[PDB]
Design an enzyme around this catalytic site. Structure first.
Site: not given
Ligand code: FPF
Ligand code: FPF
Ligand code: MG
Lengths: 297, 294
Positions: B169, B75, B285, B141, B55
């Site tokens: 995002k 995570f 990813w 977040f 990323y």
């Molecule tokens: C640390 C976490 C988990 C989120 C904030 C940091 C991010 C956005 C990392 C990015 C890649 C990722 C997990 C997604 F793109 C999933 O979005 P998303 O998390 O909305 O998939 P879902 O939570 O909806 O199943």
């Protein structure tokens, strides 16, 4: 840039197009009121019978000319309503309806009146029952030209749902049946309602894509190009591209729907011919829309 | 199969991915209280530092590890919250905010408390100004990891506009700036509002395309477009993928316009290219993470 994406629908063109076009163009050049010869020239370049022959490539040989005459006069009237009110335009078309039914005789000095009268009279003389059956679909369209539509919030899903019932598209389907001598019962038509809706949507979105500039200028709107552009926040050009891909998905759906009719033992010979003809309208409308000067190529 | 349409973007990984991954993975393996061995195998397999480097491939060499540590703990917390109620999850994260701020000392006996405490202390030690600037994005977040989503009739446009404000995002973009040492003024950030919105949608829809099967086990562009257009979910995915390519074109056009107009600074030029790699990295990813598997 608008390079159409890959399609498995190959359009067909009526073999008599050259013969019927000069016959029908010839007729209107003799009776219709064309201002200057620049108009006469522009009329012949418009090829109204050509579109008809892409829309109904399998029309019966002695019937393709009726469809060509009907769409040619309807396009000519379209050009005319453009420089008319709502009241003027509604009044204009309305007078033509009783004349179309044959209930009111035409003023032999008014081309639009006698052209319309003779056309319908000739259609009833060829096949009375089928000719009468396309009366209301034609009037629904004529009246719809001069609308007056309730303004409300409409997103992409509401717009497409709305186009599934477009009366102009129902008219083409009705005129297709007449042109092909296809007598289908409402029971048989019930069976293909989803295919009709999907086809109506495809025709309207392809027309949206190509007539956007036209509509936009005359607007200085209710079209999938503007709606998708706003919802996705992209340019109208980008929206056209995306809609074109959606059109290919509906082409695939049409094929899957046709295969289901067949699989469920619901197809009849008349329905097999009908659904194949709908496919020709979708591909023919695409070829014409992207080449005609009507939307300024 | 689903073949992605052509794209002028390409994924890229940070050069130090191998070293940083080992450095950060070891830290968590040493401090994070994993239940069983299995857990440690799953954790190393998830490779959160490798995800981070996909990323933020243009991150600075001495800052990429701060990003890997932050997303890693985030995570891990994400997974734990899965085994907690809304109220408990909220209290859990709420306790960690004052600690991230350095206002409250951590309970050195609870790893998550001191891990968070030390990471922020160290970031502030590297660049106080920039560390402080990413505080709120992380808290927005963290508080969203537990907020309740209300169901309501939603069209494509309404859905996309909602995703333009996605806090996850937003976090990615803020952390990318920190990791890249890009301190943008309010005027520069205002200048790229449209570019940010466009990128946020791209990331979200691509996630949607690949997370659909898993989700279909509700609120996603795949279902919404399939219903609005009356096509299957696979068809919707194909159409949405082309919409995604249009957003990439739009990103390039908006950046060109930025430059055309005398408004693209060296900081914004680095920043918008950074978003390009977030879009291509997110796509790879999405196509390979076990988060969306089976
Ligand atoms: C640390 C976490 C988990 C989120 C904030 C940091 C991010 C956005 C990392 C990015 C890649 C990722 C997990 C997604 F793109 C999933 O979005 P998303 O998390 O909305 O998939 P879902 O939570 O909806 O199943
Ligand atoms: C006399 C005319 C045009 C149509 C009656 C027959 C039709 C339906 C032929 C099919 C194609 C056509 C142009 C539309 F459906 C309407 O386009 P739209 O309603 O947006 O008007 P334009 O696209 O031509 O501007
Ligand atoms: Mg139009």
């Amino acid at each position: 840039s608008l390079e159409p994406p890959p399609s498995t629908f190959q359009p067909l063109c009526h073999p008599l197009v050259e013969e019927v076009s000069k016959e029908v163009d010839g007729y209107f050049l003799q009776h219709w009121n064309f201002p200057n010869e620049k108009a006469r020239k522009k009329f012949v370049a418009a090829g109204f019978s050509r579109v008809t022959c892409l829309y109904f490539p399998k029309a019966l040989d002695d019937r393709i000319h009726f469809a060509c005459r009907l769409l040619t006069v309807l396009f000519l009237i379209d050009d005319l309503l453009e420089y008319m009110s709502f009241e003027e335009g509604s009044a204009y078309n309305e007078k033509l309806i009783p004349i179309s039914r044959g209930d009111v005789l035409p003023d032999r000095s008014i081309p639009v009146e006698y052209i319309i009268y003779d056309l319908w009279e000739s259609m009833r003389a060829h096949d009375r029952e089928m000719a009468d059956e396309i009366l209301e679909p034609v009037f629904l369209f004529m009246r719809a030209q001069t609308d007056r539509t309730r303004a409300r919030p409409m997103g992409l899903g509401g717009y497409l749902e709305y186009r599934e019932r477009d009366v102009g598209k129902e008219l083409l389907a009705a005129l297709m049946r007449f042109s092909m001598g296809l007598k289908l019962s409402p029971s048989e038509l019930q069976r293909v309602r989803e295919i009709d809706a999907n086809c109506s949507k495809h025709l309207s979105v392809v027309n949206d894509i190509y007539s956007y500039e036209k509509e936009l200028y005359t607007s200085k709107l209710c079209t999938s190009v503007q709606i998708l552009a706003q919802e996705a926040d992209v340019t109208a050009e980008a929206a056209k591209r995306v809609l074109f891909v959606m059109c290919r998905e509906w082409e695939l759906r049409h094929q899957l729907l046709v295969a289901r009719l067949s699989a469920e033992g619901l197809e009849t010979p008349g329905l097999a011919a009908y659904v194949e003809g709908l496919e020709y309208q979708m591909s023919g409308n695409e070829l014409w829309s992207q080449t005609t000067l009507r939307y300024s190529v």
